[PDB]
Amino acid sequence: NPKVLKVGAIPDQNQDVLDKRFNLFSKELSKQLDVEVKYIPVINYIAAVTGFRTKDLDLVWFGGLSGVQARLQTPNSIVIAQRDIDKEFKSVFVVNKNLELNSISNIKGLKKLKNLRFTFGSENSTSGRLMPEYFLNQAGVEIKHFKGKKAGFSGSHDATIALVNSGAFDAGALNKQVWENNLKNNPKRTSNLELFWITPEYVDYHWVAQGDLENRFGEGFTKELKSVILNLDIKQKSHKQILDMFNAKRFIKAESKQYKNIEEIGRKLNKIRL
Ligand SMILES: O=[P-]([O-])[O-]
């Protein structure tokens, strides 16, 4: 249906959170743009990229890696916006309390994760896989050093927390904002977990739009869409509700140039391929 603006997102958290966030976002866009807007869930990160490529999705909340992948597969698409935090984004490594492992204050301490059961997030996660693996490798830790000579891939930051919290895995890595959200608002999910390490900064999440929206929605639509997202205003109750779900005071401009380092890291780890 070409007259519906279809919103998507990488499934980086439990579906209940995603539904609430993206349905509220969609309703606000629909009011301001005077068009039908619908959030369309997907099963995994690959499905977000491929749904964008096939034009089943028009406007998608991507991670750094998955947004790079999507824009490579889908030429002439548009980087729309990000949060302030997405310019200086971080991961956390977490460990199960039962290990009695002390936190570290230097990257070389990641060697303490060798011979443990370790899970990443999605195979295509920036904060849950790509950057954690990069940092592990800098410490001399490779996937083959983990218990079983393999790592888990949980598919989402909430799922990583749940796996380490249950003792299915000893350790994992995830989005630092998600870790903090769970720690405060869902403390039972984090009862058996301790913060192990906070990573250096890198670029992450961003909105990506199709390049052809004008043909369906009229001249100037993409500009209007970008404007609506950038002008979301913490002082307005309905905007606040949306913005709080993104753990942000505002959205800001983002350009394709800024994802060069993620792309290069992706190439080095053979992760540009889905
Ligand atoms: O790509 P995102 O899960 O940090």
Residue numbers in the entry: 2 to 275
Publication text:
Here we elucidate the molecular basis of high-affinity phosphite and hypophosphite acquisition by determining the ligand-binding affinity and structure of the PBPs of phosphite and hypophosphite ABC transporters from environmental microorganisms. We over-produced and purified PBPs of three putative phosphite transporters; PtxB from the globally important marine diazotroph Trichodesmium erythraeum IMS101 (Te_PtxB), PhnD from the oceanic picocyanobacteria Prochlorococcus marinus MIT9301 (Pm_PhnD)35 and PtxB from the soil bacterium Pseudomonas stutzeri WM88 (Ps_PtxB), as well as a PBP from a putative hypophosphite transporter, HtxB, also from P. stutzeri WM88 (HtxB)18. The structures reveal that ligand specificity, measured here by thermophoresis, arises from a combination of steric considerations and the interaction between a ligand P-H hydrogen atom and an aromatic π system in the binding pocket. The structures of two distinct types of phosphite-binding protein and a hypophosphite-binding protein reveal that a P-H…π interaction ensures high-affinity binding of specific ligands, representing a universal mechanism in these PBPs for recognising ligands with a P-H bond.
To determine the structural mechanism of phosphite selectivity we co-crystallised Te_PtxB and Pm_PhnD with phosphite resulting in high-resolution structures (1.95 and 1.46 Å respectively) of the closed, ligand-bound complexes. In the closed form, the amino acids that form the walls of the binding pocket pack tightly against the phosphite moiety and a single water molecule that is also buried in the binding pocket. Each oxygen atom of the phosphite contributes to an extensive hydrogen bonding network to the main chain and side chains of a cluster of conserved residues from lobe 2 (Te_PtxB; Y55, Y100, S130, T131, S132 and H160; Pm_PhnD; Y46, S126, T127, S128, H158 and D205, Figs. 1d, e and 2e, f). In Te_PtxB, it is not possible to determine the protonation state of the phosphite from the pattern of hydrogen bonding, but given the pH of the crystallisation experiment (pH 4.2), it is also likely that the mono-anionic form of phosphite is bound (phosphite pKa 1.5, 6.739). Both proteins contain a conserved histidine as one of the phosphite ligands (Te_PtxB; H160 and Pm_PhnD; H158), which could help stabilise the negative charge on the phosphite. In Pm_PhnD the equivalent interaction is made to a buried water molecule outside of the binding pocket and the hydrogen bonding network around this water molecule is not sufficient to determine the charge on the histidine. In both structures, the hydrogen atom at the R1 position of the phosphite points towards lobe 1, packing against the face of the aromatic ring of a tyrosine residue (Te_PtxB; Y208, Pm_PhnD; Y206).
